[PDB]
Structure formats: structure tokens, C-alpha cells
Design a protein around this ligand. Structure first.
Ligand SMILES: Cc1cc2nc3c(=O)[nH]c(=O)nc-3n(C[C@H](O)[C@H](O)[C@H](O)COP(=O)(O)OP(=O)(O)OC[C@H]3O[C@@H](n4cnc5c(N)ncnc54)[C@H](O)[C@@H]3O)c2cc1C
Ligand SMILES: Cc1cc2nc3c(=O)[nH]c(=O)nc-3n(C[C@H](O)[C@H](O)[C@H](O)COP(=O)(O)OP(=O)(O)OC[C@H]3O[C@@H](n4cnc5c(N)ncnc54)[C@H](O)[C@@H]3O)c2cc1C
Ligand SMILES: Cc1ncc(C[n+]2csc(CCOP(=O)(O)OP(=O)(O)O)c2C)c(N)n1
Ligand SMILES: Cc1ncc(C[n+]2csc(CCOP(=O)(O)OP(=O)(O)O)c2C)c(N)n1
Ligand SMILES: COC1=C(OC)C(=O)C(C)=CC1=O
Ligand SMILES: COC1=C(OC)C(=O)C(C)=CC1=O
Ligand SMILES: COC1=C(OC)C(=O)C(C)=CC1=O
Ligand SMILES: COC1=C(OC)C(=O)C(C)=CC1=O
Ligand SMILES: [Mg+2]
Ligand SMILES: [Mg+2]
Ligand SMILES: [Mg+2]
Lengths: 594, 594, 198
């Protein structure tokens, strides 16, 4: 029961009671007392990163992998905290928590210029739900207790806790048996709200549901699918909702937007007369101009956060609610409407949507040498099972991947959709694997994203954390080259050079096979499209055998312009489109996934 | 003359007028208009980094290399700006400027949640002299004009300028012929202040001058040496002042502090009766407890910043002045005192200081296998000339290097002394080489620092930027292991693993020779101490021949405890001390440098 | 000559050398050592206001009346400082200075919800050229020295100096004879610019 212990020893009991079992970090002198309490306590597996930014993105992958997870990132004072800002931003931006814990100079020296003392509280305030320097040892458990309440309540977001060295080692009296987590705050829609939304849905003749990341945040994917099935309403997931209904479900109508979107998804949205938004916001790369997106359409918006409703467009009906509470009530009311015979039949509209999904395609089956990126994603759909979990960040690599890969379960598309920090992909994939060693994790990176935090591969080697990383190498910042077309420029975006140790890379610059092997991983380079599928089969074998990351590097043609535009009705198709299965053989309409 | 142009085109003329010739950056869509103006203008050499943090630390190395330089760092919106915070902190902390320029979402969408729009102004405020989002196109030249005034005036520091996309492309009328840089503000000591300081100096019987980074910031090293020679007063440089008098000068008395310090330097400070501080602050790792540092000693402090005087200890005389203005007047007054016969002879005190410098040594000449790190620094002193320019960050690698290497000119020790961010070393060295292609740049890293931003070696390969990187590999976070001794811990600080591709690294983990070669550089691994000197000779040849970075990796014994303590009178000597040249052959007392 | 004195006594020598002769204020327990120093030093005429906002606007009128004047407004901790925000905004907005000086709780109690302790630094930062809590007794003369430089230089504006009670009464060594005001920064047009204008 009650005993005298250091404030960091009390912190270990609090973290255990709050369900923490994993931490990613880089120790230093100012955070040593915390590491010493973590060693004495046991039960937290620490993973040593090779950049503080790597540890903070591992914590994001850990959070995102499984409902209820909270990745923890640990660092010393000074530059460690400033190295966490990008991850706090990325987590805030996507409404997901991580808990960052930093050491700090002792309280008496905070306004002197103590070595590596920085005002991290002020720096981190705009990208966190709370950033606090703990000023008394007895407050360490209470700040953590409040932090966990904030990370789970309302619109979720990250917390930074900053621990002065003297506060960490100071004694307190603490009773772990008496510690209890605070209740989680979640507003719930009333029946009056939900019945109005269902009445509006029944009146629409061509409705779609836009299912957002809030549905996944609330762990409500099964209810979302059930509500769509009862009402027979096609579902458009946002990039952050992708997976909340399986991609081969007959009501999955494709994705919408300026870049990570399908031709059939955009055409279905523009033909619709109502958008029933659940757990989405209306992101600008999803909508284009809001005036065109809302034209001729009633808009419903359900969001847990009141000030998200009406922020970018005015809904006809806005409801403040947790998505699981809302969907529980939407299923009940839809079942009552079904018994009363008041849900309309929707066979024509569902048939029109499916017809678009069957004909408005993009070619993937390219035999070209050098390889076309879209062929890589066709081979990934064939090589990996239905349970594949993709991790990716940003680039033409990521945009085309979102256009052409398929996913079948929530939290099998792990992607930092609002902030898109380069280098996120490797640490996030390691964090997903740490959350779930049985997960079939496959990452996708372009060469530039792969280089930012390339040293994190050695974390996977040191700790034996296996996953497959697909690296598509054009020796370009490919997305920036494409955006420079508007300026008739191709300027400062090339990565190629004659590698003085590897004439076999043929002027592509970095030799990723050599780099990955020096970092302790396995790697395979692919030049010809028919060698992609065997390489994915070797990579699985190498992974079972050595239990380390395996990189499959595909050498691409230097320049491919991926389809994108500035409005839903203006997406330009640069590469070949398709209307038949032979050019696009891995659409779910044509291919059984597992 | 006057013409209509985009606001970014006016920015190019302003940057040219302000002396900018180099920029380090990573383009993205939101900053493309600026890149397009930089391409159209010419005359700025852009260097593409492989992490935005790498570009920001290259800008720091560029600033630090040469008086008057201002490194420029360019990035897109969102995570690029959050990736610059660590460099802004490091530059603020050391009183040096960089100019960071970020793209931003258009003004009308700043409070919507536009893709990658972040409140970078608020995040960067605590680590910059100005952080501003430019709200009108006509203000772009005026914000830059104010930015350059701030970066050069008072206590120097960094500026972040954030450019909304629509502000960048909007037209203005601008006349480059009429643009003029603002005057620089620098307070100057009066004769009444300086005469009082010289009177106090004359009364002291055992004075020392502590020469800080402010002397180098003011470009006043030659005056500092001249003032010490006229008054015959021994000089103790801080780590940030190191080089402002040559290490073989008869008045150079060694360095002082808890870690990067000499036994003779600390013993000389504790024996002194006055500290004449010029351009220093009194950093806690330099002083220890201020009560012990000031005991029995009058303190003079000259600083350009009024609120630095009395911040950590109360001087007997505090003077607000630029160090060059102060030293100009100190030389004149000392010459007047010399003509009047009022400067005391100081032969005994100078002789006592030199006697300490000759006898209070640390052993470097170790024949051990595996290699002892202190032998590496002895070989570096022999292999490189007097004009060597060292670049380093933090770790036992850096602390012992500061204890045992010698430097002979200002700005030949490039080191982020207050913030110490891991990964700084490679990008900073590339930035120094970009500032001065004739500089003989040698970097020092431990293995963990080397890994953080290891991909930046490919920047040196792509752009042919040659320098030598000494990598001392203990497969440990060695400084943290040593600080964990106080907790009877060795926990989460080891980097070793059995590399499945390289049994020759013998369980040390990452194979840096393979990684460096995959990144396009040359590399040499050294296991035996007698092979260090030949490896430095091969590295010079490889560098002349291939014009890329050359890494020399020395395999160290796993555990070496470097001398350090918590007070000047308590520094513990773990490894062998020396009182003879044979154990410490590269002290300047024993060895002629060039 | 150099002498031992309280930080507030050294502040009195600084205000004298910077030309202060008048102050408007409302005393309180947290600013009493400063009032005790003003009484002992003499040479500043104090006008007692009947609202802290009244003292802050008297300081504005005193500044605005005559070139080179700097009105000084004095108050205690807590609501006195919040009583001053409107004048700080009015002074900033018109590019003119006032010097506001507030008492504050002792440093050891600044995060402990001590009676009438408020984060006036953060509240006043948007409406001042500088707003600072002085953390060391030796810094009191230096903060005032930087304040007068900022109030006169560039675009002029007001400054708020917040004084913890333990900082005010701590002894320091200060030599009034050695104090000198900082140079004022004012940029000047070149002849090239003026000929173009004409
Ligand atoms: C290069 C690139 C291209 C992209 N292209 C596209 C594209 O074409 N189309 C596209 O759609 N996206 C695209 N994205 C992603 C896009 O930027 C956004 O991240 C995404 O559209 C946002 O999805 P969302 O509306 O579900 O929002 P989210 O960020 O997932 O959040 C939606 C809402 O959920 C709420 N919420 C949180 N928890 C709960 C809960 N328990 N219950 C209810 N509500 C809750 C939050 O308050 C928030 O308002 C792209 C990203 C990149 C990097
Ligand atoms: C692991 C590690 C160990 C270290 N160990 C030691 C150690 O043992 N000893 C040690 O001394 N340092 C040590 N350092 C470095 C230390 O932390 C500080 O960076 C350093 O001591 C500060 O030097 P300085 O006083 O010259 O200050 P600086 O940071 O260089 O600044 C001094 C002052 O210069 C002023 N200034 C700027 N421009 C001008 C100008 N034109 N004219 C006049 N003034 C100007 C600024 O206002 C500032 O107050 C260590 C660093 C690390 C990372
Ligand atoms: C820190 C950061 N800097 C810049 C960007 C802008 N950016 C987005 S994609 C991209 C290029 C990515 O290239 P690569 O990963 O090789 O992919 P490709 O587009 O060539 O497939 C850049 C620079 C960013 N998202 N984050
Ligand atoms: C971003 C960041 N995280 C953590 C630290 C704390 N830190 C200082 S030195 C060090 C270990 C450095 O190890 P290495 O570079 O191998 O050098 P060694 O001490 O072993 O010679 C760490 C983690 C830091 N300075 N910066
Ligand atoms: C894309 O890489 C780059 C070069 O090499 C092609 C250059 O010559 C210059 C000036 C910039 C650049 O980014
Ligand atoms: C018959 O199963 C199929 C569908 O569901 C009806 C579809 O929507 C599409 C597009 C193809 C298909 O085979
Ligand atoms: C130093 O590397 C580390 C390990 O391997 C030795 C571990 O087993 C654990 C639990 C933490 C760690 O940091
Ligand atoms: C004779 O030259 C020499 C000195 O200067 C007098 C010294 O201070 C020391 C320590 C050695 C030396 O050789
Ligand atoms: Mg890296
Ligand atoms: Mg690429
Ligand atoms: Mg090491």
C-alpha cells in the first residue's frame, strides 16, 4: 500500500494502471531517474530509437495500430523535446494521442541558462492538448492522470509532460492500490438528433455515407458497416476512414478527393444528392472547393468536437457525438424504420454506383522497363493477403498506393494524412509491429521519405522487429517535380548521382541495398516487372528466417505523373485509364482477396 | 529600376543585397514560388538536404564558419517548419543567426484546417528573435530587411519567415536599386567604463581573462590576443571562445569547466584572484556552483546584452558593449597605461600558470587493443595541420576531443555548445565546407550521433563536398552510460547486435563502412592503434581523388570513463593522468604545430 | 561609489539617471519595498491615483505632453497589473511609451496560486515592447536599462517590469556613478532615398 518512493516510481505505477506496456525513447542525463524507475518497476518494454524523431513516430504507429493504445515517447531535456514537435503536430493533426515525456533542468535553474534547458512548454502548446512542466513531485501522478483523461476524451490529441530532474528524484508518499484512472468524457447524440438524420436520409434519393477517421477513432467500424447495410447506402471512406468497411463490400463506393481518390468515387460523390458525414471533417484535399462539393446536396455532419461543425462548410444538420454512440443509435432507429416499412429500396442507385466502380479504372498492368509504379501496387495486391496492414506517408509513392492498393479492415491503412512528415514511414511501421507482433505489416516509401530516418532500420535489426518495406525509387522528389509543372520548372528535386561504389545503380545515387544491409537488415533490388512477385516471395522467406526488416527496392522510371487535380470534376489522367479487368486486374470487382 | 514582379522575386533581390549566396533546403508545393524565383534570379547556390533538419543544421555550420555569414534554410509548410525548431533552438542558444524560410497555406485558409497548415509562428517564437507570417506581398521585402537587422544586431539570433502561398505569387512594384540594408545596432563601452576595468585589472595580482563566444561573434580575436599580450594576462577561452588565442600561445592557459576542460585550466582558475570576462556568459558547465567559482575573485563581465549581466552571478563590474568596441578601447587604454609605466610585471603568475600547463596532463599514448579513444585524438593532432577546423556536437567523443585536440584560429572549433543536438555534426560540417571550400574540415562523432542524420553523407556525395569524418565507435551511448553510474544502472544505452551481414563488426551492430559506401562516400575501418595514422593518410588521398566525404571509423573498447565532475575542484580522473610528454606527446608545450 | 543596497534602491538611481521625476500609482503590500526606496531616495514626485487605470492613463498623458517624457505607473501584484492592460494597449497602439512597474509574489511561490499572483508577463506581452518578471536582484538595474532603450528606440512602445517581492528587497552591490543609459537606435534615410523622394 502506502509508501515513500520517488516521484518517478509513482509514475511507473500510474503508467501501469493506465495500460502502458511499451515505450520508445532515447535516454539522457536529465531523464535518467525516470529510466531508473522504469528498470526497477519492470513490465514496460523499452525500444531504443536511433533518432528522437524516430521514437516519437514509433509512438504514433503504436497508437494508431490498435484501439485504446497510447504510444509513449521518452527523451531528455533540450533538443530531445524540440525533436518531438513534428510528431506532436502529426498526432494533433489526425486527432490521435501520444504521450511524450521529457527530462528538464532542475526548477531553480529554469530561468538561468542551464545547459540544454529550453521552454518546451511554450514550444509544444500549439500542437498538444496539454504541455506542462511539472513543478512539484506530488503532482507527477496527477499530471499523468489528467494527461490520460485528455488523451482519451473529446477530440483526442497528444500530451507532453516535462519533468525537472529534482522533481523526478524527490520523495512522495504514494499508494498504488488507491490510484484510479479518471472517467473518459464523450458526448452522445440524442434520439431526437438521430431521428432527424434518418428522416433526412430517407428523403434523399442518391445518398452516400462519408465515413471518416472518427469512426475508426471510436472503434465503431462494425456498426458503420451494419448501418450502411440496413439502409443500403453506399459508403465513401475518407483517407482516414479507409478500412472501416472492406474494399470488396458491395456498398464500398471508392474514395473521393483531389489525389488519394478513385475516378468512380469522385463521379459517385458528384452524382449524389446527400452526404451523410460520420466522424469526418471536410478536408480540403477531400472536397476541393466546398461550393462544388456541396452543390445540390444536403450535408449531415456528426463530429465529437463542436467547433469542427461548420468550420469549413455549413451542414444542413450538425450533431455533436462520439461516432460509436451515434452509430449505436443510428442502427436502432434504422431497425425501427425497417420494421415500419419506411426505408426506401435503393437498388438503382447502388447499381449505378457499382457500374461506375466497374468501368472508371486506371491501368496497373505495365510490362515496361524501367518499371511503372502502378505495376508495383498490382503486385502488392496479389502477393499479400487480405490481412495486410499498409503503412505509408506522402509522395507519388503514397498517392498512387492509395489509388491502387486495397484494404479490408480498420487500422490496416496507417497514414499521417493531415501532416505528412517525411521519414514517418519506417518508425511508424516499427511502432505498429511493436503493438502487434502478429500484424502483417507492409510499408510503402519513395526514396526520399526512406532516406530521412533510414537509420531506424537498425532499430528493427537490433530488436528483431520484422516487416516488409516496399521502396519505389525514382531518384526524384517525385511529388514536388509534378507540382513544379505549374512553374515550367524541374528544379532542386533530383537525387541522382554516379555512385562511386555502385555502378550497378546506374546513376540513381544512393545504393539502398548496401545501406539497408549495413544497418543489419535484408534487401532485394528489382529492375524488371516480372521479378517483383518473386521478390515479394523471397522477402517473406528472408523475414521468417532472419526476423529483421526486409527492404524490396523497385527501380522505377524517373518520371511518372500520377492522376490528380484541383477539383473533384477536374482530376487529370496523365497515364492510361482502363475500363476492363485486363489492364486493372486487382480491382475487387475482378479479384477475390483471400 | 522600378518594375512589377512577384513578391518572391523582390525577395531574391533583397537576399542578394544582404549578401546571401547559398541556401540549404527541401522544396515542396507551398514553397515552389520561392524556388521558382530563386531559379529565375540565379546567384544563389542551393544545396538539397536529405532531411529538413539536415538543411537547418547546414545553415548553422555555414553561419558559424565565417564572420558575417548567414546560413539560409528553406522548407515547405507544415512538418518542414516543425523540423526546423531544433536548429532555431541551437542557434538561439549560442547567439548566432540562421534565416529559416517556410511556405504556408494561403491566408484565407489559415484557420480552416488546410493540408499541412500549422501555427509555426507560435511554435517558433520562444527560439527565435522574430517569427512572423507575412500577411501582405509588399511586406515580404520589409520583413526580410528587419530580419537581417535582427540577425546582426544586439545579441544575434535566428529568424523564421513564413510565406503564405498567395502572398508569394502576388505582384508588387519593387525597385532593387533603391533597397538598402538597415544599420546594425551595437552598443559600445565608454572610456569611463573601460578605464575602471583596466584599473581593476592592474590591482589584481593573479588575473585571468575568460574569452567567450562573444569575442568570436564580434570578429575580435586579434584584438583579444593583443590585449592579453599588452597586459601579460593569461587567457582561458570558454568552449565557445576556443581558438580566439592560439593553443600554443604562451598566454593560453587552458579551458575551464566540469567536462570540456583541462586539469591545468581549472587549477589556474581556482588560483586566480580576478576573472576578466569578455563576451562570455557564465555557463553552468563552465562554472560549477557559482559560489565556488567566484570565491576570492573580483569578476568583470563585458556583454553586448544587458540582461545577460547578473543573470547567473553578480559581477563586481558589468559593462554593456560589443566585444570589438570594448577590446578596441581596452587596447588603447592599456597602451596609455604602458607608456605611463602603470602595467605591473606578471612574470611569476604567468610562470605559475605555464608550470601547471606542463605538469597537469592526461595520458593519450595508449597501445591498447581495442583502441582507447584518447589515442585517437593524439593521432588527429599529428595527422592534421595547424589550420584544421574541427566540427563536433556531444558525447564522450566530443568531451574527450575538447580535452585533447588543439586548435589555432577562431572558428576552427565549430560546436553547438549550449543545445548539443545529436545528428548536428554531419550537416554542420557540410555547411562549413559550403562556406569555405578551402577549409580543412575534420568532424568528430560517436556512433549514435553519426546515425541520427547519417543520410546527409549522400548530400556530400551528390554535391561533391569533401571533408574527413572521424567516427569513434563504442556501440554505446557512452556519455549516458557514464551518467548512469550514479544510478548503479547500465540500461537502454547499448547499440550492439550481431550484424547478419557483417560478422567482421564482431557484434558492434551497424556496419558504418557499408552504410557510408552505400550513401556514395568512402570509408575506412581501424581496429589497431598503429593503423590510425595510416588511415588518416589514406583518407586525405581518397578525398583528393573522389571529392566526397571520407569516414574513418575507429573501433573503440566498449567502456571508457572520461574525466568529469560536478565542481572545478572535484573533476575525477578515471583514466591514467600524465606529468611527462611521453604519455601526452601532443600538448603544445611538447609539439610544434606546423 | 559602489555600495550595498536593496535592488529597489539601485532601481531608484537608475530611474533618476534616466530622467524620471514623477510617478503615478497605487501602493500595495507587494510593491511596498519600491515605495520605501522611492521615499528614501527622494526626487520622484508621487501622485496617488483613485483607480489603477487612472494612474496608467496619467502616465500616458505625461509621456504625450513633452518630447522625451516617460510616464511611470506603479501598482501592486494581481489585479493592479490587469488594471493596466488598457493603457499598455493605448500606449502601444499610438507608438508612445509608458513604464509600468508591478509588485509580484516571491519567486518560490509563483506557481503555487499565492494570493494575488497572476501571470502578468503573458497577459501584457501582446501590448508591450517588453513585459518581464525580473528573476534576480542583480538584473533589476539591467532590465530597467533595457526598458529605457526599448521605449526610446525604433517605433516607441511601453514596457511592463514585474518585481517579485524577494527580488526587490535582496541586497546587491551597485555603483550609481558607473551607470550609463544605453544608446538609442534610430535608423536614418540616406541621401539617395531623399533625393528620389524630392
Ligand atoms: C498527399 C496527400 C493526399 C491526400 N489526398 C486526399 C484525398 O484525395 N481525399 C481525402 O479524403 N483525403 C486525402 N488525404 C488525407 C487528407 O489530408 C485528410 O487527412 C483526410 O481527408 C481527413 O479525413 P477525415 O475527414 O476523416 O478527418 P480526420 O482527421 O480523421 O478527423 C475527422 C474528425 O473526427 C473527429 N473525431 C475524433 N474522434 C471522434 C469520435 N470518437 N467520434 C466522432 N468524431 C471523432 C475529429 O474531431 C475530426 O473533426 C491526403 C493526404 C495526403 C498527405
Ligand atoms: C557535453 C558538453 C560539455 C561542456 N563542458 C563545458 C566545460 O567544461 N566548460 C565550458 O566552458 N563549456 C562547456 N561546454 C559548453 C557550455 O555549455 C557553453 O556552451 C559555453 O560554456 C558558453 O560559452 P560562453 O560563456 O562563451 O557563451 P556564449 O553562448 O558563446 O555567449 C556568451 C555571451 O556572448 C554575448 N555576445 C554575443 N555577441 C556579442 C558581441 N558582439 N559582443 C559581446 N558579447 C556578445 C551573448 O550575449 C552571450 O551572453 C560544454 C558543452 C557540452 C555540450
Ligand atoms: C519534412 C517535409 N519536408 C518536405 C515535404 C514535402 N514533400 C512531400 S512529398 C516530397 C517528396 C517525396 O519524395 P519520395 O519520398 O522519393 O517520393 P516520390 O514522390 O518520388 O514517389 C516532399 C519533399 C514534407 N512532406 N515533409
Ligand atoms: C536529440 C538528443 N537526444 C538525446 C541527447 C542526449 N545525449 C547526449 S550524448 C548521448 C549519447 C551519444 O553517443 P555517441 O554519439 O555514440 O557518443 P559516445 O558518448 O558513446 O562517445 C545522448 C543520448 C541529445 N544530446 N540530443
Ligand atoms: C537537384 O539537384 C540540384 C543540382 O544538381 C542537378 C544543382 O546543380 C543545383 C544548383 C540545385 C539542385 O537542387
Ligand atoms: C457481383 O459482384 C460484383 C459487385 O457487387 C454486386 C460490384 O459492385 C462490382 C463492381 C463487380 C462484381 O463482380
Ligand atoms: C540497450 O538495449 C536494450 C535491450 O537490449 C540489451 C533490452 O533488452 C531492453 C528491455 C531495453 C534496451 O534499451
Ligand atoms: C618554452 O616554451 C614553452 C612555454 O612557454 C614559455 C610553456 O608555457 C610550456 C608549458 C612548455 C614550453 O615548451
Ligand atoms: Mg536520418
Ligand atoms: Mg522519389
Ligand atoms: Mg557511442
Amino acid at each position: 500500500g502506502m509508501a515513500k518512493m520517488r516521484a518517478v516510481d509513482a509514475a511507473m505505477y500510474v503508467l501501469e494502471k493506465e495500460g502502458i506496456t511499451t515505450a520508445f525513447g532515447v535516454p539522457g542525463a536529465a531523464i535518467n531517474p525516470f529510466y531508473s524507475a522504469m528498470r526497477k518497476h519492470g513490465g514496460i518494454r523499452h525500444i531504443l530509437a536511433r533518432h528522437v524523431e524516430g521514437a516519437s513516430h514509433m509512438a504514433e504507429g503504436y497508437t494508431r495500430a490498435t484501439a485504446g493504445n497510447i504510444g509513449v515517447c521518452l527523451g531528455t531535456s533540450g533538443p530531445a523535446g524540440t525533436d518531438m514537435i513534428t510528431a506532436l503536430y502529426s498526432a494533433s493533426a489526425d486527432s490521435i494521442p501520444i504521450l511524450c515525456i521529457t527530462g528538464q533542468a532542475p526548477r531553480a535553474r529554469l530561468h538561468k541558462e542551464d545547459f540544454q534547458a529550453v521552454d518546451i512548454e511554450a514550444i509544444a502548446k500549439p500542437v498538444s492538448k496539454m504541455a506542462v512542466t511539472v513543478r512539484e513531485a506530488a503532482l507527477v501522478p496527477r499530471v499523468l492522470q489528467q494527461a490520460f483523461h485528455l488523451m482519451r476524451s473529446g477530440r483526442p490529441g497528444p500530451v507532453l509532460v516535462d519533468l525537472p530532474f529534482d522533481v523526478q528524484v524527490a520523495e512522495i508518499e504514494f499508494d498504488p492500490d488507491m490510484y484510479e484512472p479518471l472517467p473518459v468524457y464523450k458526448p452522445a447524440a440524442s434520439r431526437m438528433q438521430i431521428e432527424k438524420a434518418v428522416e433526412m436520409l430517407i428523403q434523399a434519393e442518391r445518398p452516400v455515407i462519408v465515413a471518416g477517421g472518427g469512426v475508426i477513432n471510436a472503434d465503431a467500424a462494425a456498426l458503420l458497416q451494419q448501418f450502411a447495410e440496413l439502409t443500403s447506402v453506399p459508403v465513401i471512406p475518407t483517407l482516414m476512414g479507409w478500412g472501416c468497411i472492406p474494399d470488396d463490400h458491395e456498398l464500398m463506393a471508392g474514395m473521393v478527393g483531389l489525389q488519394t481518390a478513385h475516378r468512380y468515387g469522385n463521379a459517385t460523390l458528384l452524382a449524389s444528392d446527400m452526404v451523410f458525414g460520420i466522424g469526418n471533417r471536410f478536408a480540403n484535399r477531400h472536397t476541393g472547393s466546398v461550393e462544388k462539393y456541396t452543390e445540390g446536396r444536403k450535408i449531415v455532419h456528426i463530429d465529437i468536437e463542436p467547433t469542427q461543425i461548420g468550420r469549413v462548410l455549413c451542414p444542413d444538420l450538425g450533431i455533436v457525438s462520439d461516432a460509436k454512440a451515434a452509430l449505436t443509435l443510428l442502427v436502432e432507429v434504422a431497425q425501427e424504420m425497417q420494421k415500419a416499412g419506411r426505408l426506401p429500396c435503393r437498388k438503382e442507385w447502388v447499381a449505378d454506383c457499382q457500374q461506375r466502380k466497374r468501368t472508371l479504372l486506371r491501368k496497373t498492368h505495365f510490362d515496361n522497363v524501367p518499371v511503372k509504379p502502378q505495376r508495383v501496387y498490382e503486385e502488392m495486391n496479389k502477393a499479400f493477403g487480405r490481412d495486410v496492414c499498409y503503412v505509408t506517408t506522402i509522395g507519388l509513392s503514397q498517392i498512387a498506393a492509395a489509388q491502387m492498393l486495397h484494404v479490408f479492415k480498420d487500422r490496416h491503412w496507417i497514414n499521417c494524412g493531415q501532416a505528412g512528415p517525411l521519414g514517418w514511414t519506417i518508425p511508424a511501421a516499427l511502432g505498429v509491429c511493436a503493438a502487434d507482433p502478429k500484424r502483417n505489416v507492409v510499408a510503402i516509401s519513395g526514396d526520399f521519405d526512406f532516406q530521412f530516418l533510414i537509420e531506424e532500420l537498425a532499430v528493427g535489426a537490433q530488436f528483431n522487429i520484422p516487416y516488409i518495406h516496399v521502396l519505389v525509387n525514382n531518384a526524384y522528389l517525385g511529388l514536388i517535380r509534378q507540382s513544379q509543372r505549374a512553374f515550367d520548372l524541374d528544379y532542386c528535386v533530383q537525387l541522382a548521382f554516379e555512385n562511386i561504389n555502385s555502378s550497378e545503380v546506374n546513376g540513381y545515387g544512393v545504393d539502398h541495398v548496401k545501406v539497408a544491409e549495413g544497418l543489419g537488415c535484408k534487401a532485394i533490388r528489382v529492375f524488371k516487372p516480372e521479378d517483383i512477385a518473386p521478390a515479394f516471395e523471397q522477402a517473406k522467406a528472408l523475414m521468417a528466417q532472419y526476423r529483421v526488416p526486409v527492404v524490396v527496392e523497385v527501380i522505377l522510371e524517373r518520371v511518372t505523373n500520377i492522376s490528380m487535380g484541383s477539383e473533384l470534376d477536374n482530376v487529370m489522367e496523365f497515364e492510361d485509364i482502363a475500363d476492363n479487368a485486363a489492364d486493372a486486374p486487382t480491382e475487387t470487382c475482378f479479384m477475390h482477396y483471400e
